[PDB]
Amino acid sequence: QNTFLENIVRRSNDTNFVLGNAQIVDWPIVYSNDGFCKLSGYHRAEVMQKSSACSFMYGELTDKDTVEKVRQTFENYEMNSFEILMYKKNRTPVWFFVKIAPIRNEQDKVVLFLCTFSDITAFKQPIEDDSCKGWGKFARLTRALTSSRGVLQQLAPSVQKGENVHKHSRLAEVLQLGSDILPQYKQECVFKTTWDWIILILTFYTAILVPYNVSFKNVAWLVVDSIVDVIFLVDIVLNFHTTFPKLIRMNYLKTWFVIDLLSCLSSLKVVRLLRLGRVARKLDHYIEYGAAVLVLLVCVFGLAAHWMACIWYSIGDYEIFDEDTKTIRNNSWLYQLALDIGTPYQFNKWEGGPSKNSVYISSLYFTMTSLTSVGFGNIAPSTDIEKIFAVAIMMIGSLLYATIFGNVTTIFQQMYANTNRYHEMLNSVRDFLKLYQVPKGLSERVMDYIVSTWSMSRGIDTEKVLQICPKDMRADICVHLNRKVFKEHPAFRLASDGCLRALAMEFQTVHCAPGDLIYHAGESVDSLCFVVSGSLEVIQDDEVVAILGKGDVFGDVFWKEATLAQSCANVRALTYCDLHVIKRDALQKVLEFYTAFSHSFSRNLILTYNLRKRIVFRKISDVKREEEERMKRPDHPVRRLFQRFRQQ
Amino acid sequence: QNTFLENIVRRSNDTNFVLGNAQIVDWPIVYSNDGFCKLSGYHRAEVMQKSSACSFMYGELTDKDTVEKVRQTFENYEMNSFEILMYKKNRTPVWFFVKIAPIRNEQDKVVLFLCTFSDITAFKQPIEDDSCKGWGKFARLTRALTSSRGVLQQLAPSVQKGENVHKHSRLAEVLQLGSDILPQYKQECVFKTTWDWIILILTFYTAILVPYNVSFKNVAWLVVDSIVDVIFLVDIVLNFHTTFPKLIRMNYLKTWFVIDLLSCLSSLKVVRLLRLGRVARKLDHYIEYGAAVLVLLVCVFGLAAHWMACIWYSIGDYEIFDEDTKTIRNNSWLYQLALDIGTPYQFNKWEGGPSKNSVYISSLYFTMTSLTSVGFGNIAPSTDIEKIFAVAIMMIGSLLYATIFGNVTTIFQQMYANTNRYHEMLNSVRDFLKLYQVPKGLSERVMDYIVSTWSMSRGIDTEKVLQICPKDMRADICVHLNRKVFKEHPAFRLASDGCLRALAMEFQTVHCAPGDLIYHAGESVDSLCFVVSGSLEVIQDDEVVAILGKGDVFGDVFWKEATLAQSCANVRALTYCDLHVIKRDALQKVLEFYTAFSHSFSRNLILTYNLRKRIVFRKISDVKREEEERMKRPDHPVRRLFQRFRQQ
């Protein structure tokens, strides 16, 4: 987007300016702000289309040498600055400081001119053609140079030598504005995706490995642990730096920085469990995707399984040796587990029982039985704290199983509604056709039409899709849709592009099935048709009169006739035909609007077949009958009727 | 709401009255009831806009002193009462008792007057200008004062001295009506939320603690128990008192009072279980909220878990010692539990086994295994009555789990349909654009438009939302929407507010994307546009002619021209532009209706750019070519065409 005006008016700070066209003779004004309207005393429409030299603002005391200096700076495309007595709408002699900056382009062309203004009346000299008094003209000069003296020469009324300080500072403000004349009238991440992916898999790593290291407590795991720490710190500084600079850093310190700092800095290793705060960055990224939330629920299901498995082992380990009496108590899932798999605990000391890998996967098996509502009961809780933990994990497993089932059911509901609406409309059409006892050929024809247009369109109301777009986008879409007419016919290559869009907005598109007829003989012809694909036959009295191929126009010339006629012939299709039709009313609307186009349209459009003009012909069977009639070789009430035919 | 008429007509009880404007000269009538229409013999329209002094009702025998007394009471705003012979539409001499009450305000202003009437013909004297007989005029007097004598002086025909009793009682009824002249023509809980919250958490408390105290049977718990009792009694008297006074008390005694009284008054502590009847007050309050019903189902799930856990312990305790033979029977979940955790039962007496806290949480673990369909089977039923209880609780747990799963699935279905409709329309648009092979730039443009308007609008058919509102509310919404025009332009600050609404109902609002053009050069200009935000360029022959900023009007003046023209220039947008457009047909409808406004509209509205008037200009490249043409330095069939240009 090109915010060429907004940057100038933001930098300007109550100073005023006009914009003129640098590439047009006499340099006409294309824009003037309200400050220039107030200082000039003119209105926007009255300012624009005048010269940006502001020759209408000149006067008898306006120096012509400054005028040709302005002309030279406009011709040479040169940043300059001048002061000149110019007049207003009330013809007051007002000295102006015009600063002219050419405007380059992305193509570096000198396309515009910027002329900024101020009032230098009080700064130089008061000169009046007539005034009430010297104080009155002086007061008018001070009131005119109000925003010059006021909001720029603030402390300058205390000091002397304002021409040496404050006027030079206003000229330097115009110089910094010329430094800000850079917008030049032109329009002015995958690393984040890959970074969020690798920190997501590392958050899965730490959510597996931290409760593992809490409960069950090499070297290369510590190496990759330090890699996890430094990559997390790099992610913190990237969450500082990257887009949504200092305002997003303050927003990050408000939002998430305390958790993300304490997450990755000896019991406080459980504080590392808060590293899943990074996962909420990706959770919004794939909540729109639906089938991946099933994968999200399965992943958090396994993650919570690993979590509460380590919690379950922690409960067993807290329970076996909770006292200094060192009793096994004959009651724990660890003790029943050691009696189950073998090697019960022994003492010589207290020699441990089961191996830690078997312990972890046995505990994960137990937590999976809990969260999956299976519940075998090999490992099954019998101590107090493990039982209240069992209640807790069963209440969590119910909700996790519910969320999985609801997500799967919603996935199936979308995947089934998208086909169920089509199957239901097909079933209702079959029900309707069976209701009214359509002859089976026509029922099959309408049915295979419905299946064909549902295979082609895939269930898209394309006209409604065009209603979703705005006006110009829909018109340009229609122009691309009717490129198959407009690039092909000589009738349309002389049209204006506005006429192209105002035509293309009226063109329906027909997908004729083979064997299906468009205009039956006797139907109203009200829409000339262009054939962009397929092959057509024209049947007059059971006889093929015209074969229409690609790029042919039939129907009836409306703009010459202005008369509705009957189709003198059937028009049937031979192949899958693509037609681009236009009714006569919209055609006549466009042709009445585009008057200079319509004559060239009449001269260029040659109908391949008039569907009004019945063509006279005889069959060869008829002249064979006439040749047979050599073997054969009152009229007064009827021949007068033939004389009425003579009167006809 | 100001039910100023309804209170008067309810209090009136067949007496009649008029209402007149107290702040308008001559005191015109604003209202007269049907009783006054019947007594006066006049119609409503014929009564209104006459004086409330009813000077048209006066006659030759009407006392002018009473007329100026009425005038003085109207001027001084004074409650008074008079009797006067006045005439009807058939000019009958009818004595009236007018009672005049001024009407104060919320601002205490004397805004209306109330004049109530009756017939005092028979009470004072019969005087006729002419009549058929004395009995006939007397009969007409009795028929006229029918509702006076009938429904007010009921037992007075038995007694004498009706002027001393019944007429004074009718005047006192008018005095009580003046006491009821108080409506004055003006418009005439968080404690319940917090109270229902604290009784809801106390119902959770009693639903946990009463089966606890039934099955497992300090002092501070008894203190807070008595607090529970007194707070429940205060809730009973608040359910008596508070809104939906005596009718809601009778409705409460019909509805819920028997249950709520027996709930909070030694086996009948189980009767305290009916205290959950208060919860049905909150159940209707949060059935509209959907995500909280998941919390409701989880809370009643845990509540039923605690319930049937206490029932399970009650079953075990009933089963261990059901006889006087004192057999342990080697079969109970309590006995298997005591053999599991340790300390089996012993006798010396019968020394108990497991501790009651372990017993309760073990039983709650069992009931959670039942209701969560996990079913480990540490505690697992083996006696008869515990098995039929197990069937009962499994049949309850199936339905509770089903309701949880259905509620979770509905929550996910709402949360997924709201994004799935947008993702499906986006997928169909991408499918349609890929179907017809749009050049990729235009496909990306329409796609980013769709995503931009779905980020801005968030999927709201705002026009349909305006269709939901009624007429005046939709008009006022449109006026607030077009405040960005109406507060800014000098064209609209002279309009009537009806003209403001009838204009604002026609203003579409366009959100122009940057780089997107509104009127292509050659398109029909039929809608003048106001620019309330953004920046626009006007391109005539690939050259910027006019930059349009905030508060500028383009298009074409329709009401002067009454002619449809072509756009002589493209009009493209530079920034995100907000336009408020109006087509020429609705504009011409409004301007034809608001005739006095349309002249000021024509005088005040200055077009920033006529899109009809093509502007003549030359390029500087062209005059550079002309300066080059110094190096270069039959017409008769064509120059006559130029002479035809002279003819043009």
Are B232 and B202 a contacting pair, CB within 8 Å?
yes
Q: Which residues pair with A583 in a beta bridge?
A: A527
If one counts every other C-beta atom within 10 angstroms of the C-beta of residue B92, the result is: 19
Q: Is A121 helix (H, G, I), strand (E, B) or coil?
A: helix
Are B531 and B505 a contacting pair, CB within 8 Å?
no
Q: List, as ranges, residues 333-362 from B with C-beta within 8 Å of A.
A: 340-342, 357-358, 361-362
**Which residue shows structure tokens 């301007």?**
B591
Tallying the residues shown for chain B, one arrives at: 648
Interchain proximity A187–B515, CB inside 8 Å: yes
Cβ contacts of B574 on chain A, cutoff 8 Å = 1-5
Q: Is A568 helix (H, G, I), strand (E, B) or coil?
A: coil
Contacts of B513 (CB under 8 A, 6+ apart): B445, B448, B449, B452, B573, B576
Cα Rg of chain A, angstroms: 44
Q: Phi first, then psi: give them for residue A103, nearest 5 degrees.
A: -115, 115
Helices (H), A436-495: 440-456, 462-468, 471-481, 483-486
If one counts every other C-beta atom within 10 angstroms of the C-beta of residue B440, the result is: 9
Q: Is A397 helix (H, G, I), strand (E, B) or coil?
A: helix
Cα Rg of chain B, angstroms: 44
> Tokens at residue A280, please?
């909420």
A455 touches chain B (CB under 8 A): no
Query: Can you give the three-state secondary structure of B549-587, one letter per residue?
Result: CCCEEEECCHHHHCCCEECCCEEEECCCEEEEEEEHHHH
B318 touches chain A (CB under 8 A): no
Residue type, B345: Y
Interchain proximity A390–B368, CB inside 8 Å: yes
Resolution (A): 4.0
Q: Which domain holds residue B511?
A: 462-610
Q: Which residues pair with A573 in a beta bridge?
A: A536
A146 touches chain B (CB under 8 A): no
Interchain proximity B431–A460, CB inside 8 Å: yes
Breaks in chain B (C–N beyond 2.5 Å) sit after 188, 217, 244, 265, 348, 633
**Alpha-carbon distance B422 to B409, whole Å?**
20
Q: Is A534 helix (H, G, I), strand (E, B) or coil?
A: coil
Measure A331 CA to nearest chain B CA, in Å. Answer: 6
Q: Is B41 helix (H, G, I), strand (E, B) or coil?
A: coil
Interchain proximity B517–A23, CB inside 8 Å: no
**Alpha-carbon distance B116 to A399, whole Å?**
72
**Alpha-carbon distance B48 to B31, whole Å?**
6
**Alpha-carbon distance B555 to B484, whole Å?**
18
A470 touches chain B (CB under 8 A): yes
Q: Which residues pair with A21 in a beta bridge?
A: A112
Cβ contacts of A31 on chain B, cutoff 8 Å = 546-547, 549
Which of A28, A391, A498 is opposite residue B617, by nearest beta carbon?
A28
Q: How far is CA B257 from CA A19, A597, B271, B273, B274, in A?
A: 82, 86, 14, 15, 12
Closest to A583 (Cα-Cα) out of A517, A526, A510, A525 = A526
Contacts of A344 (CB under 8 A, 6+ apart): A335, A338, A353
B544 touches chain A (CB under 8 A): yes
Interchain proximity B436–A481, CB inside 8 Å: yes
Tallying the residues shown for chain A, one arrives at: 648
Q: Which residues pair with A580 in a beta bridge?
A: A509, A530
Are A306 and A313 a contacting pair, CB within 8 Å?
no
Q: How far is CA A386 from CA A320, A328, A382, A539, in A?
A: 12, 16, 7, 89
Candidates B409, B414, B616: best to mutate against A (most CBs of A within 10 A) is: B409
Long-range contacts of A325-330 (CB under 8 A, 24+ apart): A326/A350, A329/B342, A330/B342
Measure B233 CA to nearest chain A CA, in Å. Answer: 35
Question: E strand or H helix at B409, and its extent?
Answer: helix B384-435
Residue type, B55: S
Cβ contacts of A487 on chain B, cutoff 8 Å = none
Candidates B294, B370, B411, B416: best to mutate against A (most CBs of A within 10 A) is: B416
Order of all β-strands in the sheet with A536-539: A544-548, A536-539, A570-573
Are A568 and A597 a contacting pair, CB within 8 Å?
no
B488 touches chain A (CB under 8 A): no
The domain that holds B509 is classified in CATH as 2.60.120.10
Residue B648: burial class (beta carbons within 10 Å; 0-12, 13-18, 19+): exposed
> Tokens at residue A366, please?
């137990």
Q: Closest chain B residue to A187 measured between Cα atoms?
A: B574
The string over A112-123, giving b where at least 16 C-beta atoms fall within 10 Å of a residue's C-beta and e elsewhere, is bbbbbbbbbbbb
Number of H helices, E strands in chain A: 27, 15
> How big, in percent rounded to 5, are the helix, strand and coil portions of chain B?
55, 15, 35
Cβ contacts of A388 on chain B, cutoff 8 Å = 361, 365
Closest to B482 (Cα-Cα) out of B460, B462, B509 = B509
**Alpha-carbon distance A578 to A575, whole Å?**
9
DSSP per-residue codes, B438-486: --HHHHHHHHHHHHHHHHHSSS--HHHHHHHS-HHHHHHHHHHHTHHHH
CA A84 to chain CA centroid, Å, is: 50
DSSP per-residue codes, B289-339: -SHHHHHHHHHHHHHHHHHHHHHHHHHHHHHHT-STT---TT--HHHHHHH
Residue A335: burial class (beta carbons within 10 Å; 0-12, 13-18, 19+): buried
- Beta-carbon contacts below 8 Å between A and B: 226
**Alpha-carbon distance B404 to B415, whole Å?**
17
Interchain proximity A6–B425, CB inside 8 Å: no
| Pairing of β B552-555 and β B609-610 | parallel
Candidates A21, A32, A458, A483: best to mutate against B (most CBs of B within 10 A) is: A21
A182 touches chain B (CB under 8 A): no
**Alpha-carbon distance B544 to B539, whole Å?**
5
Helices (H), A145-219: 146-149, 166-179, 190-215
Interchain proximity B543–A413, CB inside 8 Å: no
CA A47 to chain CA centroid, Å, is: 38
**Alpha-carbon distance B579 to A81, whole Å?**
37
B401 touches chain A (CB under 8 A): yes
Measure A289 CA to nearest chain B CA, in Å. Answer: 9
If one counts every other C-beta atom within 10 angstroms of the C-beta of residue A440, the result is: 9
Q: How far is CA A107 from CA A180, A186, A380, B434, in A?
A: 19, 9, 78, 33
Closest to B9 (Cα-Cα) out of B168, B187, B177, B188 = B177
Q: How far is CA A579 from CA A449, A488, A499, A544, B508, in A?
A: 16, 14, 20, 20, 35
**Alpha-carbon distance B268 to B488, whole Å?**
76
**Which residue shows structure tokens 């202005």?**
A562
Interchain proximity A501–B523, CB inside 8 Å: yes
Q: Closest chain B residue to A473 measured between Cα atoms?
A: B446
Which of A370, A469, A471 is opposite residue B374, by nearest beta carbon?
A370
Cβ contacts of B431 on chain A, cutoff 8 Å = 458, 460
